[PDB]
Structure 1
Amino acid sequence: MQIFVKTLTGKTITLEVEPSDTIENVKAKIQDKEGIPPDQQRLIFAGKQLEDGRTLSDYNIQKESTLHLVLR
């Protein structure tokens, strides 16, 4: 499944994930693709800050949904 991760510069990163991946797993895939440490990543989806132990499906994140990446 592809999802998009949009940075605050408007850059759209395409990420391959599984629908059951946890947010922590997603941050690890961003680390693998972009080289950003997971502790420096904050992901926002439809108004909510995403929590590490929950799954993408828990949040209703679907194919080609966009997560917003804020660096902390």
Structure 2
Amino acid sequence: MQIFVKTLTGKTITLEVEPSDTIENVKAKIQDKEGIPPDQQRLIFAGKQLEDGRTLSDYNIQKESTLHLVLR
């Protein structure tokens, strides 16, 4: 599955993932793309705060879903 992650500045990162990939996996992939440390990353999908050890399928993240990096 392909997803999009938008940074704080609105920059789009395209990621290739699987349903079973954890949010922690996703965060390391962001770090590789942008240099943003996993411990600085807060991810939201469909207004839900995403926990490191849950999976994309656990949040109903699907093909062509968009996640946001946020402050809080």
The TM-score normalised by the length of structure 1 is: 0.90
* Identity score, percent: 100
Aligned to 1:39: 39
More strand by share: 1
Q: Secondary structure at the match of 1:67?
A: strand
For the Cα contact (< 8 Å) 1:23–1:56, is it kept in 2?
yes
Query: What secondary structure, in the 3-state scheme, does the structure 2 residue paired with 1:71 have?
Result: coil
With 54-63 and 6-15 compared, the bigger mean Cα shift is at 6-15
Range 2-11 or range 58-67, more displaced: 2-11
Maintained 8 Å contact 1:40/1:71: no
The number of equivalent residue pairs is 72
1:60 Cα offset (Å): 0.2
Deviations along 1:33-65, one digit per CA (max 9) or x if unpaired, are 111110000000111110011000000000110
1:71 offset after TM fit, Å? 5.2
Structure 2 distance, partners of 1:71, 1:17, is 24
CA-atom RMSD, angstroms? 1.3
- Structure 1: gaps spanning 5 or more residues: none
Helix, strand or coil at the partner of 2:42: strand
Tell me if 1:28 matches 2:34: no
Deviation at 1:69, TM superposition (A): 0.8
Long gaps (5+) in structure 2: none
Please identify, of 3-12 and 45-54, the stretch whose mean Cα deviation from structure 2 is larger.
Answer: 3-12
Greater than 4 Å deviation, 4+ residue runs: none
